[PDB]
Amino acid sequence: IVGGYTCGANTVPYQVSLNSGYHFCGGSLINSQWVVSAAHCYKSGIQVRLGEDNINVVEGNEQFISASKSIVHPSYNSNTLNNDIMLIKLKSAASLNSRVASISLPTSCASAGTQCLISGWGNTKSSGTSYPDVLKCLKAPILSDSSCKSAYPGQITSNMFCAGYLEGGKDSCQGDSGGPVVCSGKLQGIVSWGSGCAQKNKPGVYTKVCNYVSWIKQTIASN
Numbered sequence: 001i002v003g004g005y006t007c008g009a010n011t012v013p014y015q016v017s018l019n020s021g022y023h024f025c026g027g028s029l030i031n032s033q034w035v036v037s038a039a040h041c042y043k044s045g046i047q048v049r050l051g052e053d054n055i056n057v058v059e060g061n062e063q064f065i066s067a068s069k070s071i072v073h074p075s076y077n078s079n080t081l082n083n084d085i086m087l088i089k090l091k092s093a094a095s096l097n098s099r100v101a102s103i104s105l106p107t108s109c110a111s112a113g114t115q116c117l118i119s120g121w122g123n124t125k126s127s128g129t130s131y132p133d134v135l136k137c138l139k140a141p142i143l144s145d146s147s148c149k150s151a152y153p154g155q156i157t158s159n160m161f162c163a164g165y166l167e168g169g170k171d172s173c174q175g176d177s178g179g180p181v182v183c184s185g186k187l188q189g190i191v192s193w194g195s196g197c198a199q200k201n202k203p204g205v206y207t208k209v210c211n212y213v214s215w216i217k218q219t220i221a222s223n
């Protein structure tokens with residue numbers, strides 16, 4: 001997250017870290033045994049880390065659970081990043097409380113102008129590299145589809161939305177991928193892609209979760 005603020009320990013209780021020997025992507029806990037992330041975060045051998053703040057220090061609220069199965073969306077296209085969503089089943093159910101909690105799925109899509117919370121352990125610099133060890137947060141609005149398509153001609157599908165600031169300075173970045181965009185207490189987006197981080201006229205692009213609710217619910221019900 002560039003231009004964000006330190007969330008505070010366990011203030012974003014649905015945020016997960018995906019770990020393969022190191023943190024490589026975020027995700028969101030949507031019930032006691034399932035996480036949603038970005039398909040471009042797919043790899044074998046994932047450990048899901050819940051209850052994290054400092055990802056390099058054991059602080060006492062963590063739960064470390066290996067994945068038992070990963071399901072990339074059937075129509076994911078790695079070249080365009082259309083349908084950039086995947087589900088991860090945990091080998092065992094997590095223990096839910098105030099510091100580790102699921103986030104509700106949306107019943108309706110969010111409209112442009114709605115303010116959302118984006119979080120992650122990604123890079124904090126738009127030029128260069130500095131990775132934080134504690135979770136960072138950013139409040140940002142959903143932008144109009146017209147402005148999103150004008151910033152990224154020919155690249156925005158119906159399964160994507162833009163959020164952030166056209167003036168730059170505040171954005172999600174590398175290492176935030178897969179993490180949540182939460183608006184009015186519902187998971188509306190997944191950190192997906194952008195042209196650099198925090199550049200003028202190049203806001204972040206997010207997977208539009210409301211289009212996938214049926215696929216999520218059907219997949220969970222049978223796996």
Ligand SMILES: [Ca+2]
Nearest residue numbers: 054057058059
């Ligand atoms: Ca920790």
